[PDB]
């Protein structure tokens, strides 16, 4: 799994990318984030980079984490790695300390595809993972038509069936940095049950990565999205 390696070894360009992720959302400027796994441990570090080069691609890598400012939060830290993108998530187990469960996406990082350098035509099919609290088994499928500058997709096979939602058709747009981004609706039985946001990643738009917020009978559930090709 190379989890320990990711905590002790320095960056090595020979490792499979994504080689490095810059932790920002995962750890605010005034805080410290400690990650532990396979006997090793390392503290971060707003702006510090996580050696994702040592982790397996297309899988969730898992660490124990403690977030300090004094302990504020602890639980499991999840990292899903692709070649030009990667994201982190926090499964909360403990807050101020008392037991409390929450799930949240942290950083979504990588080589953003410029909205101004997108392929001019053709369709791309992305296949990958949707992972939520206690469930990294979801299958994500997403299609972008670059002529139409539109995307849509679907989540399948998550254990909680009302998370298996339609990611409705949406426009590709530039954000503030000219990154290509897609924001749309989540649909379940034709009703809007939340929203999703994807960034396009890679110089040839090889990947999408982002998240979804899905309204369920038992409350809002947050999902991490990542697919490729």
């Amino acid at each position: 799994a190379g989890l320990a390696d990711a905590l002790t070894a320095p960056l090595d360009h020979k490792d499979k990318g994504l080689q490095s992720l810059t932790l920002d959302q995962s750890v605010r400027k005034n805080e410290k984030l400690k990650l532990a796994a396979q006997g090793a441990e390392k503290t971060y570090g707003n702006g510090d980079s996580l050696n994702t080069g040592k982790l397996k691609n297309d899988k969730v890598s898992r660490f124990d984490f403690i977030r300090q400012i004094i302990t504020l939060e602890s639980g499991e830290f999840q990292v899903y790695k692709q070649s030009h993108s990667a994201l982190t998530a926090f499964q909360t187990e403990q807050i101020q300390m008392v037991a409390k469960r929450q799930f949240r996406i942290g950083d979504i990082a990588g080589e953003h595809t410029s909205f101004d350098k997108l392929p001019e035509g053709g369709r791309a099919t992305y296949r990958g993972t949707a992972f939520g609290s206690d469930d990294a088994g979801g299958k994500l499928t997403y299609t972008i038509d670059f002529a139409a500058k539109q995307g849509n997709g679907k989540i399948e096979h998550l254990k909680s069936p009302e998370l298996n939602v339609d990611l409705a058709a949406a426009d590709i747009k530039p954000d503030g940095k000219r990154h290509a981004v897609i924001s749309g609706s989540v649909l379940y039985n034709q009703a809007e049950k939340g929203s999703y946001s994807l960034g396009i990643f890679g110089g040839k738009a090889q990947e999408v990565a982002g998240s979804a917020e899905v309204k369920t009978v038992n409350g809002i559930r947050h999902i991490g999205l990542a697919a490729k090709q």
Partner: antibody
Amino acid sequence: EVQLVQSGAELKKPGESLKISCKASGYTFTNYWVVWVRQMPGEGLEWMGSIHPRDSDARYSLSFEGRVTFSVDKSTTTAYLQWSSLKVSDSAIYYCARLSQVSGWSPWVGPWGQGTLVTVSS
Amino acid sequence: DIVMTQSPSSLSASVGDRVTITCRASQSISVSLNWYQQKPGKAPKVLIYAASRLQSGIPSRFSGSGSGSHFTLTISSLQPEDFATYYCQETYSDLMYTFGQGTKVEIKR
């Protein structure tokens, strides 16, 4: 094709234990809930509960919660229903079935196994 | 915990008749509702899901309507092969998808 093939009809004495099986094939075993349904001859369908093969998350309805145990064998993609102590009133047909779903829509039950007739008597 | 009840429990109608079965839930379940058909000695077969979505392979004389706590299965022209008992099922809750008690449909000839 997707198939769910259950084991043969059973006769057991009251108080005995019994494990019936449900062989799933033609699809990815760990992507779908397995569902168990009881039906007394001439009566309605009864949702007993379900189990997810991916991590063996088992759910039981109040009426069956202690009397039956769901389990799964991933290497053989087989689901199992087991009684530890049978009663005459357990005499009935039992279905397994896949919980299916089109993304963006409420799920349904199907395909179904052919059903297993369990007869409890001495 | 969610209770589904069907009416009638038994009905009889002539071939070509319009048949209506109603399904009720003890609480609002939006449109997360299925209809199944079951014939003698066979497992049930889904007809409709999400209250009104016709499964492929199922004849269009079957249609479903309603929402919240009140739902309807309609057979527009009862055919001989439609002899069966019909079940609703709520798929609203956290799994635990309970069935209505069933409605037997027989043909008047």
